[PDB]
């Protein structure tokens, strides 16, 4: 919108074409990560961590 | 048999002893029943329900 357009041009920020869907720890629960498993579609390239 | 096993433990037949308030340090009128009860923690934990 207009005020947002002014805001961006004042501060010079590129608004990303990507929205943040990242998985984050549920509010209030605190623990230690003991395991990580990555499942990949057969035929899609496995990432670095995987 | 219970009282008889209390005799072997040096502890009274009544199962009741004298107890003192940790606050005023004074004794509690009348003997109170103290012992060892097996107690379970069910999982209703408040940080879930809340």
């Amino acid at each position: 919108t207009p005020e947002e357009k002014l805001l961006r041009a004042i501060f010079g920020e590129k608004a990303s074409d990507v929205k943040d869907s990242s998985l984050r720890v549920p509010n209030g629960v605190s623990g230690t990560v003991i395991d990580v498993q990555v499942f990949t579609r057969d035929g899609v390239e496995k990432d670095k961590r995987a | 048999e219970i009282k008889e096993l209390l005799k072997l433990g040096d502890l009274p037949t009544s199962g009741q002893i004298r107890l003192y308030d940790g606050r005023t340090g004074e004794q509690f009128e009348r003997p109170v029943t103290v012992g060892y009860m097996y107690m379970l923690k069910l999982n209703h934990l408040v940080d879930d329900k809340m």
């Binding site: - | 408040v46 940080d47 329900k49 809340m50």
Partner: protein, 51 residues
Amino acid sequence: REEAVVWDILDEVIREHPVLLNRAPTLHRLGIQAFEPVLIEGKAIQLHPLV
């Protein structure tokens, strides 16, 4: 961020602002009663014995 100040602000908004307490089997109107909030450290609701 839960900055330390906000707590005191909460103590301000809680003071004269009542809250409603209700239980599951509501029968008579006393099944819902208003109280005055007292901030408590814990996840449990403290309810006056006489009620």
